A paper describes a structure:
Bile salt hydrolases (BSHs) comprise a diverse family of microbial enzymes that catalyse critical BA transformation. Primary conjugated BAs synthesized in the liver, such as the tauro- and glycoconjugates of cholic acid (TCA, GCA), are deconjugated by BSHs to generate cholic acid (CA) (BA names and abbreviations are summarized in Supplementary Fig. 1). We found that Lactobacillaceae BSHs display a clear bias for either glycine or taurine-conjugated BAs. Notably, each monomer contains a loop that swaps into the active site of a neighbouring monomer within the tetramer and places amino acids proximal to the catalytic residues.
To examine the molecular foundations of [name] substrate specificity, we determined the crystal structures of six of the Lactobacillaceae BSHs examined above: four glycine-preferring (LgasBSHb, LaciBSHa, LingBSH, LreuBSH) and two taurine-preferring (LgasBSHa, LjohBSHc) BSHs. LgasBSHa structures were determined in complexes with taurine and taurine plus CDCA. We examined the sequences of these loops and found that taurine-preferring enzymes exclusively contained G-V/T-G (‘G-X-G’) motifs, while glycine-preferring enzymes solely contained S-R-G/S (‘S-R-X’) motifs. To confirm the importance of the selectivity loop, we first created two variant enzymes that swap the central residues in each selectivity loop: a V211R mutant of the taurine-preferring LgasBSHa and a R208V mutant of the glycine-preferring LgasBSHb. We found that both single-swap mutations significantly decreased the specific activities with preferred substrates without significantly impacting the non-preferred substrate. We examined the activity of LgasBSHa G23E and LgasBSHb E21G variants and found that they decreased activity with the preferred substrate without impacting non-preferred substrate activity. Third, combining these mutations by adding a G23E V211R salt bridge in LgasBSHa further lowered the preferred activity, while removing the salt bridge in LgasBSHb E21G R208V did not further decrease the preferred activity. Fourth, we created triple mutants of the selectivity loop sequence. Both the LgasBSHa-SRS and LgasBSHb-GVG variants exhibited the greatest reduction in specific activities toward their preferred substrates, with little effect on non-preferred substrate processing. Importantly, without altering secondary structure, the triple mutations significantly decreased substrate selectivity from 76-fold to 14-fold for LgasBSHa and from 353-fold to 2-fold for LgasBSHb.
Residue numbers in the entry:
A (entry chain B), B (entry chain A), C (entry chain C), D (entry chain D): 2 to 316
The structure:
């Protein structure tokens, strides 16, 4: 998986992710309307303060999201964090206890500003518990963003719960976020500007085509390498104007770092690849997505009809 | 640029390209109908006998194509070949003399089989002449394909005219095609299969995520590096079923190797990037494209209406 | 810098380092004999009880070592650790307080087993103080080894004091040691075994020479890349027999990852390169070294003569 | 194998090679004195015009050299050239016919200047024949050098006989020399100057140590990779003064690109590694060498005693 966010020159947010997996979970776009029932394992059951949209599966009436985005422009995406993610054996007294899967709706329902999310997380404890005993607990970490800031939430056996400011606007998978930040120092030789003709002891050595300044940029799907490349592309991609250009920019970047079918076979013999790529535009409250076997952009919207529905809207 | 071709298991051809440039040239989709006037600089003037579709620019009624594809499922794309391409100073008696830009329509009008093209190219002479003196001659090389085979045509100062069978289904830019073929032997270490946990003198060393077998796959836009990655992806991408899946597979591959805006600045200070990606489906006579600033797939079609029109159709 | 240790099949230790710097420090080989005065900044002054040998400089009669090795087969090397190394403002009551430069002789004088060192370091506090006002405090970390185990000692602002078991037998520079261990997992695609001929959709793609399994092995001098390569080389180098063969193996590995003059120019305009390579053979109590401008191996030995001298012996 | 040459600022030549093979061949230093019997397969038998020194094997009184250097400062080294090298099926009338192994003494016996060698090679034909039936023909190419110029000689099935000027002063193995020269253009991003602190959207991204400018420099033993690194190191290594410093510079470069035992296993299960490194100093007529299992520099010299001996001098 790769998560990505950026804004245009006016603070309109574009935020989304590739889902890179080796199986079909049956996911689809789900709109959760306002005042929908919202049960919690360790908190008072309530109803939704806000409408949200995202990709997920419905389980006994509960919309379980891979990523979701609220009508007020705040979103979250859960990304695989294997060999690292580790949650509580059970709830802890005096903490806001959440089964890990509950963080998706806890964040998007209760907040609009990442600043408030960060303050609240100081008292959150994530618990190693699935929605029911028929599901395993996914080892995830999360990227959360509004128009001003993205943060990373990681709860690991190694380090406990850590929350990072993510000025790069990207996230991939293991290892931990600070490891990846540190890795970027090793790629400061990367330069968008082309090299030019040189004299190697009088032998002319000159580029054959453009792109020579990014010598050493990795193109494989190892999480560390997609992090380096996603960050490099995001920070150097110009700011563009308008919905179409910003959505295209977003898909240009994530399709660049997609996991291509056939090029990755896991130890069990299964292909792993980018099954979908999705972008939420906060400005238009529109969720854009396409799929490995269907490249046409599909669009779904939080609007008057959908946000005020009486039930979950599934597509 | 990157050209790409493959088929499904029924022999349906998908064939197209990224155009990587620093500039919008004002190009667009042009359908050239049957019976359209076709002058030549050295051959007899005639008319088109086959409808073609592709991206290009109209100059004084003449459609000058970046890529184009005839109704019988054979196509050609011209890609940048700097520091190599060089054509004859003039026509040569006894040869089929073509100003280099004329190869696009000469190929698509006169052939349905690449085996016929390869035979006729033995007596072809490309000439260093533009449609008129108000235009430069572009230093190009070409990939030509039908459902059965792709060939590369290169005319260089270094080696004269060479025609290669292209079983990899790909082409990028300089240097010459045999140089790139030879380069692939240096990447035989690439493996789609993940590595697994190792013992380095008792220290556990194990992958953090999937993708570790392709260690060393380059991710920059240097032509040689895009050639290795495009070829690697194409031969390992499985055969897929149906029009939507094959079109998506095509764009999955070419967007993976696209030149991302801001990540490449040429020596004159201009961004170079993939301005469009296009795919011709022979089976549906459909030209699909999207653009750097508009990601939605657009479709243009050779059908009874467009193939028999009285004029060039421009969109 | 790169530090390196391994043994033969009989537990004879070979342990040393490259010194990669951009200034001439006038270093030379120093033997400190038994019963030599040994002042401390915070501990009671004393005398040496074990002869040591290594490279360093003499300050006011004090041998300040880059690396040193005692007659009982235990040694230590200090390597640059910039942007990480951070020692305490002053001594802490209750701790064994050492100015950081004092760890060299404190380790080699008081210990013959790394397991005792590990235990004792639990009460050590390193202090940010140089030998005198005219010297800056060097931002170092250390590798310590006997014939059975190597440990890394790092004291950082980020993490405080950490002590690691170093099964890879290597150390370079920043960042911290657990970061480097973690990085190794991204290189599990490395394989000493050559690849063999492949068919890329019927195109024969085959190695031109040996070595194709180590595709992606980095050859630059970034510390993380020298760490990967040094570790890979050390753990895959066969065990060899005898002093000559083990010393050559040692220099083969370290010269492979040396920083070559002219290939690295620091931000101040100065060449940085491997000024010397040194190997201590515990079995023969011999210090072998050569220099950037003189490749002949020079040998210096802890002798009945030298170990019982009346003064420092400086070459 | 890697061949290497350079001069100091007085035109003093230092020229040598790594031999990278799977097993020791029993080779050793051989001095061939003046007036020594010199048979030829297809030329008149004669005696040596000059004394030469190098590494090789004596076969029935004939010194068969891996590299040899004459008393007037001209030398030659034969390196592996598999999948390319192809010599003529028998001698050709009108040519100077040499069994490929005979080029070693023919060049060093008959010439002082590389300019004269280049002119003479216009009439040379290399024949596919070994010294006798007990040996196979090795697929070799050659680097030849004096104080002014180095040339590469390659005779291939693909291109016939080619002679190149080698301003880089390096040679490795396959593919052909022009392929490698062309490859260098893809490494123009290499820069000895360190990168400096950067702001990635406000995130400080800065080097952890020196060496960041050479990002992407390959460190594996694939011939194309060692060629890039050897060329890069040689042209950027400063000119140094005096015999000791120049010999050390020479071993610094070649040991940097040595093939390290255990890191390369060919497809027949054999380790491949640098068995020796050797440097001929023309100014002192001294052959220096060390071996994988003995790092001490050994020295052998052409002087009045050895150049006027009455037999081969072996060591
Ligand atoms: K509840
Ligand atoms: K003869």
């Amino acid at each position: 998986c790769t998560g990505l966010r950026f804004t245009d020159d006016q603070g309109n947010l574009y935020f989304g992710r590739n889902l890179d997996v080796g199986q079909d979970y049956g996911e689809g776009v789900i709109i959760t309307p306002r005042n929908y029932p919202l049960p919690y394992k360790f908190l008072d059951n309530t109803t939704t303060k806000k409408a949200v949209i995202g990709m997920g599966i419905v389980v006994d009436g509960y919309p379980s999201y891979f990523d979701c985005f609220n009508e007020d422009g705040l979103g979250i995406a859960g990304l695989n964090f294997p060999h690292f993610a580790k949650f509580s054996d059970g709830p802890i007294d005096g903490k806001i206890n959440l089964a890990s899967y509950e963080i998706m709706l806890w964040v998007t329902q209760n907040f609009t500003k990442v600043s408030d999310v960060k303050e609240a997380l100081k008292n959150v404890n994530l618990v190693n518990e699935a929605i029911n005993s028929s599901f395993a607990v996914a080892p995830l970490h999360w990227i959360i963003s509004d128009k001003d800031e993205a943060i990373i939430v990681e709860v690991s056996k190694q380090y406990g719960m850590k929350v990072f400011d993510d000025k790069l606007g990207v996230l991939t998978n293991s290892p931990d976020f600070n490891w990846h930040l540190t890795n970027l120092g090793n790629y400061t030789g990367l330069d968008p500007h082309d090299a030019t003709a040189q004299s190697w002891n009088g032998q002319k050595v000159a580029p054959w085509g453009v792109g020579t300044g990014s010598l050493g940029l990795p193109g494989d799907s190892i999480p560390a390498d997609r992090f380096v490349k996603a960050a490099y592309l995001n920070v150097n991609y110009p700011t563009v104007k308008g919905e179409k250009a910003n959505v295209a920019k977003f898909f240009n970047i994530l399709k660049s770092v997609a996991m291509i079918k056939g090029s990755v076979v896991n130890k069990l013999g299964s292909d792993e690849y980018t099954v979908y790529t999705a972008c939420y535009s906060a400005a238009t409250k529109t969720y854009y997505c396409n799929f490995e076997n269907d490249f046409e952009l599909k669009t779904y919207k939080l609007d008057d009809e959908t946000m005020n529905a009486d039930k979950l809207i599934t597509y």
